[PDB]
Symmetry: C2
Subunit: 79 residues, 2 copies
């Protein structure tokens, strides 16, 4: 970990920092289909869930898309 | 990019997939303090903003925390 401190003044009032969010694989259970399928890795960045892009999507909204899948979950994953 | 397809049946009804979200540095502008300070990198994962942990925080909420910093922004960033 490193700390970074940005401080405004009349020389520069702009942080000049654009943030995003990404959805990632936190854990795969030993007993689940994710593990049994064997393709997904913990820490993988999920790019799409069932056609819908996940960049900047909230975790809550991404979880809703998983509940919506109705037993068919097509993921696209960064590699 | 690779595709992964998980399919439920009576043999296994558990995806067994826990998701998280992380906040990351999308861009630093050429003219901004982030660039001028020189420590932050594009693609860095932000772990905390002014003491508040960012794992699983929405982008909207994280952005609110940057607006609340009032000209002093202390970040903790993943290097590990």
């Amino acid at each position: 970990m490193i700390g970074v401190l940005l401080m405004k003044s009349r020389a520069n009032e702009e942080y000049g920092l654009r943030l995003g969010s990404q959805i990632f694989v936190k854990e795969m259970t030993r007993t689940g289909l994710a593990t049994k399928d064997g393709n997904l890795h913990e820490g993988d960045i999920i790019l799409k869930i069932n056609g819908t892009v996940t960049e900047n999507m909230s975790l809550t909204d991404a979880r809703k898309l998983i509940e919506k899948s109705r037993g068919k979950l097509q993921l696209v994953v960064l590699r």
